[PDB]
Amino acid sequence: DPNKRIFQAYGNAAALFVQMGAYRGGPTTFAVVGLASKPIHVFRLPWYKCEWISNNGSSIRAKAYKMLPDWGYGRVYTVVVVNCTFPVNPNQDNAGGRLMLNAYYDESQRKYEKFTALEELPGSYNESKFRPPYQYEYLYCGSSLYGNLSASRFREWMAYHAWFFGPSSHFVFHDAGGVSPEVRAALDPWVRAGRATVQDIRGQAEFDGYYYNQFLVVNDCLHRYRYSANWTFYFDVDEYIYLPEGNTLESVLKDFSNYTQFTIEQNPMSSALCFNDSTQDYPRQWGFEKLLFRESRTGIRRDRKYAIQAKNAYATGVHMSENVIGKTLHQTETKIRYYHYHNSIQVPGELCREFLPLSAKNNVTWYNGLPYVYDDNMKKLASTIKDFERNTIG
Amino acid sequence: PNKRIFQAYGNAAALFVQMGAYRGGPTTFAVVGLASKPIHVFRLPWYKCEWISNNGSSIRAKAYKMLPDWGYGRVYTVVVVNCTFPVNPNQDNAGGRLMLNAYYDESQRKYEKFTALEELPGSYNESKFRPPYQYEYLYCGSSLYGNLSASRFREWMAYHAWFFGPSSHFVFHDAGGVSPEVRAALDPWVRAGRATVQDIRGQAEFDGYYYNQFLVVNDCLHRYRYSANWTFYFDVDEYIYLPEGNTLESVLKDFSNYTQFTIEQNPMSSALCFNDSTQDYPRQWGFEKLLFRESRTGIRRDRKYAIQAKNAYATGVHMSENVIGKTLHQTETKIRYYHYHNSIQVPGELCREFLPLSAKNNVTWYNGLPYVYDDNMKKLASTIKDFERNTIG
Ligand SMILES: *[C@@H]1O[C@H](CO)[C@@H](O[C@@H]2O[C@H](CO)[C@@H](O[C@@H]3O[C@H](CO[C@H]4O[C@H](CO)[C@@H](O)[C@H](O)[C@@H]4O)[C@@H](O)[C@H](O[C@H]4O[C@H](CO)[C@@H](O)[C@H](O)[C@@H]4O[C@H]4O[C@H](CO)[C@@H](O)[C@H](O)[C@@H]4O[C@H]4O[C@H](CO)[C@@H](O)[C@H](O)[C@@H]4O)[C@@H]3O)[C@H](O)[C@H]2NC(C)=O)[C@H](O)[C@H]1NC(C)=O
Ligand SMILES: *[C@@H]1O[C@H](CO)[C@@H](O[C@@H]2O[C@H](CO)[C@@H](O[C@@H]3O[C@H](CO[C@H]4O[C@H](CO)[C@@H](O)[C@H](O)[C@@H]4O)[C@@H](O)[C@H](O[C@H]4O[C@H](CO)[C@@H](O)[C@H](O)[C@@H]4O[C@H]4O[C@H](CO)[C@@H](O)[C@H](O)[C@@H]4O[C@H]4O[C@H](CO)[C@@H](O)[C@H](O)[C@@H]4O)[C@@H]3O)[C@H](O)[C@H]2NC(C)=O)[C@H](O)[C@H]1NC(C)=O
Ligand SMILES: *[C@@H]1O[C@H](CO)[C@@H](O[C@@H]2O[C@H](CO)[C@@H](O)[C@H](O)[C@H]2NC(C)=O)[C@H](O)[C@H]1NC(C)=O
Ligand SMILES: *[C@@H]1O[C@H](CO)[C@@H](O[C@@H]2O[C@H](CO)[C@@H](O)[C@H](O)[C@H]2NC(C)=O)[C@H](O)[C@H]1NC(C)=O
Ligand SMILES: *[C@@H]1O[C@H](CO)[C@@H](O)[C@H](O)[C@H]1NC(C)=O
Ligand SMILES: *[C@@H]1O[C@H](CO)[C@@H](O)[C@H](O)[C@H]1NC(C)=O
Ligand SMILES: *[C@@H]1O[C@H](CO)[C@@H](O)[C@H](O)[C@H]1NC(C)=O
Ligand SMILES: *[C@@H]1O[C@H](CO)[C@@H](O)[C@H](O)[C@H]1NC(C)=O
Ligand SMILES: *[C@@H]1O[C@H](CO)[C@@H](O)[C@H](O)[C@H]1NC(C)=O
Ligand SMILES: *[C@@H]1O[C@H](CO)[C@@H](O)[C@H](O)[C@H]1NC(C)=O
């Protein structure tokens, strides 16, 4: 009795699997996006198995594999995309069923977790969703927004990009606390117009600090709207897509047709450098109308953003996808870029804070040990965007 | 609708896995178990200790931890939680239980609180932390697993019951290795009150997720902290040997002013024996048989140790790094141990590579290593066999 030793475990320092979303990505294939506890030492094979349980008890086994697109180190959890693919539509009949997932600890699979990842009710399967035409031409997948964010910037970003991507475009935001009541009011005209979706992901709080927030959202957004549009764009609300003179959005995407994804080089802008000029009413100018100074360094590599055809994507990361079918284009510099106003969206008050002489229009200005040049490309569109906003939401 | 849900499933790593909670003195306790390490989150304190007495009151204790194993490569790390009070929280002997809080990190507010141990009213007996103690020496064995040979256990128990004398006890930890054959070999010693075979077969739930040997040494350390003057740590394929001119009492007297000392190794072949028909190897014991010692010089070799548990807080598998007092390694002339590597899990006759009688005086190269003749243990076989028949029959 006393020599019958017992090992009493307490607490749960890491779940095996945390599901954020589960989506059908075609007549034949599904994706489960979430978090996983990585194995240590013990060999884990398989990580998962997928089954479809039709509503009359019959089960069809699926070919399952996973992708771990985040850094892989430094956090309790790693973002995981579980790809379940069947030989035929397991719900071809449309009688309904359930995609079930098995999650394993080690190859000595005594213990495992089985759960329903999603249910399709009888008659709800709809093959016309994976056939053209799709809901939108373009879809913006937003980052996870947290902190003290400026409503005025959201107002200006939405107006600019609602114009940039045209009427057949939708915008998906992920609210992790950053969407203030004031930011929400800025998005409200577009929400009410059916153009913007604001997802509440404030329930992620109990996991904050235990995984990489941006890698989860990009992959969930990738599969939640996999067939909603033809091109999914990934960038932040302090970043503005721009087409150099002599290009349309349809022109550039047509030149990029035969590529599954393409990257977009950055035009880094100062969020503080403005002209010393009592002529200008900076409190009444928009961000990209005021911040006209671009860091001028040549031949230095900077962070990039990207657009992707989710049809041919299985997972993705923050700056591009590593899990696609098809080619990847990077030579995009002459035809599409994005202006980046770093550390602008969290700034209260006037963004204009370091004021330069009018001499700086034609000379190189040194600020924070970096060279800058005048660039008014975006300021030239401020008038066009403001009319568009008035003509679209009043 | 758009209110996203995060559905968690499973438990891939508990926060704390207790194996044993122990009173280490009038003022202090220890909780030995496993812990999940924090990953990029600040965890401080890891634990808090509280004594809820049957009197009603509740006194907090100073709590600190020790992580004596490698600290990486496994889901869990072995932990010894040390709870010390300014006064015996049960001087009243009114009873009470030692509560232990375990925390995930500073960010999260809730934690895990459980009963590490409970002391019924009138069970505390201070005289158990003062001499005389139950035994003079105690042996703390390893986690026993695999297909183990019962004949080796019998030879080992017979030798070390003689080596350590009558006031000695032997603690074995059965994690699967104590077959019915092995158990029968130990049964004469168990029935005589000289050996304890703990059942730690419940360890299989966590097999592969922590360092087996590090957990057992630390639970044995505190489980029998004041049971003996000295606690010896080594395996059943290892035999403590005293170069002639030294007795156990003699050596331990020279070492008294040291809290622990390490013991160098004499590596033996578990396969090499003489090509000699006058030898009846099926009727010879292991150390009576395997007479060839690996002879390389200046080579870093594993060591074993003995420790005065009363002044130890945690330990490892080759020595402790959490003690008060000196540590001694210059022991090479006075005490050693013969190590018969990969012998215990071998079925059948150990003698398997047979050498000419010439090998008594030359170096023998086997598997690329040099070996020499060494009959120091064989000389004692008759003594051990006489002691066995005169002790267990
Ligand atoms: C889980 O993982 C599994 C894999 O482990 C995923 O399943 C894979 O998904 C892939 C993407 O959906 C899929 O690849 C696509 O298959 C389509 C169907 O092809 C069928 O026919 C061919 C024979 O012709 C068969 O061999 C094949 O097996 C199928 O039966 C193809 O149509 C797709 O091809 C297009 O993209 C590739 C990528 O480079 C091109 O090479 C190809 O030429 C096609 O390119 C056209 O379309 C792209 C845009 O998609 C344009 O950029 C390009 O310029 C072409 O555009 C013209 O043509 C289209 C019409 O096709 C037209 O609309 C357009 O306007 C232009 O005129 C592609 O090959 C894999 O087969 C599939 N694998 C398996 C085993 O199932 C699963 O999705 C994952 N699940 C989740 C949830 O992530
Ligand atoms: C949790 O953690 C806490 C703290 O982190 C742990 O608490 C600490 O535990 C220590 C070890 O148990 C303890 O230290 C010991 O205290 C003993 C009692 O001290 C009382 O007596 C001394 C006088 O002897 C007073 O000064 C003191 O104020 C107390 O009243 C001491 O007896 C121990 O001293 C001996 O060991 C040290 C370390 O080597 C020597 O330096 C010292 O000289 C003593 O050495 C003699 O004994 C050892 C064997 O014990 C011999 O090796 C040595 O050669 C000497 O032997 C002669 O003398 C002894 C007399 O005992 C005689 O029997 C023998 O035959 C020889 O003639 C030691 O110092 C800390 O005080 C204590 N701290 C606190 C804050 O509580 C707690 O244990 C942890 N919990 C668990 C479960 O692990
Ligand atoms: C997404 O792209 C597809 C493929 O380019 C579009 O479908 C094609 O549209 C053109 C022009 O209307 C037709 O000539 C082709 O026959 C269509 N192809 C197929 C396979 O149907 C589709 O219109 C785009 N989706 C949206 C919402 O604009
Ligand atoms: C544990 O060690 C102590 C310290 O040497 C032993 O107690 C001493 O024994 C001698 C000889 O009998 C006495 O003269 C001393 O007075 C004892 N010391 C104390 C503090 O009482 C003790 O015998 C050892 N334990 C066992 C079981 O042998
Ligand atoms: C939001 O504001 C508070 C105080 O104004 C600040 O402590 C907090 O850090 C801000 N959020 C972020 C993400 O910086
Ligand atoms: C279109 O993309 C495919 C990759 O799926 C590639 O093999 C093919 O060469 C591309 N077509 C052209 C004209 O480059
Ligand atoms: C609990 O025991 C302690 C120690 O004797 C004492 O100080 C305290 O008064 C006791 N509590 C009660 C409620 O009597
Ligand atoms: C115990 O024996 C069985 C077969 O006899 C074997 O499969 C197993 O591996 C053995 N144990 C070890 C530790 O080798
Ligand atoms: C052992 O002894 C026998 C009998 O002398 C001999 O035939 C044999 O070659 C010796 N060596 C080995 C390896 O068996
Ligand atoms: C006895 O041990 C103490 C440490 O507890 C040490 O300071 C002292 O030097 C030792 N005695 C001798 C003679 O080395």
mmCIF file of C-alpha atoms in Angstrom, chain B residues 4 21 40 59 73 110 147 149 159 193 231 241 270 322 325 336 360:
data_model
loop_
_atom_site.group_PDB
_atom_site.id
_atom_site.type_symbol
_atom_site.label_atom_id
_atom_site.label_comp_id
_atom_site.label_asym_id
_atom_site.label_seq_id
_atom_site.Cartn_x
_atom_site.Cartn_y
_atom_site.Cartn_z
ATOM 1 C CA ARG B 4 -14.521 33.397 -32.949
ATOM 2 C CA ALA B 21 5.963 14.561 -0.344
ATOM 3 C CA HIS B 40 8.869 32.529 -22.950
ATOM 4 C CA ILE B 59 1.189 29.509 8.195
ATOM 5 C CA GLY B 73 15.211 17.184 -23.876
ATOM 6 C CA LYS B 110 -5.276 31.039 -11.394
ATOM 7 C CA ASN B 147 14.262 -8.206 -19.093
ATOM 8 C CA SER B 149 18.431 -11.599 -14.818
ATOM 9 C CA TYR B 159 27.481 -9.428 -1.948
ATOM 10 C CA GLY B 193 13.353 -7.060 6.275
ATOM 11 C CA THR B 231 22.883 6.745 1.277
ATOM 12 C CA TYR B 241 34.873 -2.773 -3.726
ATOM 13 C CA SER B 270 30.501 -8.931 -19.457
ATOM 14 C CA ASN B 322 22.512 20.807 -3.851
ATOM 15 C CA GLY B 325 29.223 20.722 3.165
ATOM 16 C CA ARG B 336 35.895 1.758 -6.149
ATOM 17 C CA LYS B 360 46.231 -13.678 -17.566
#
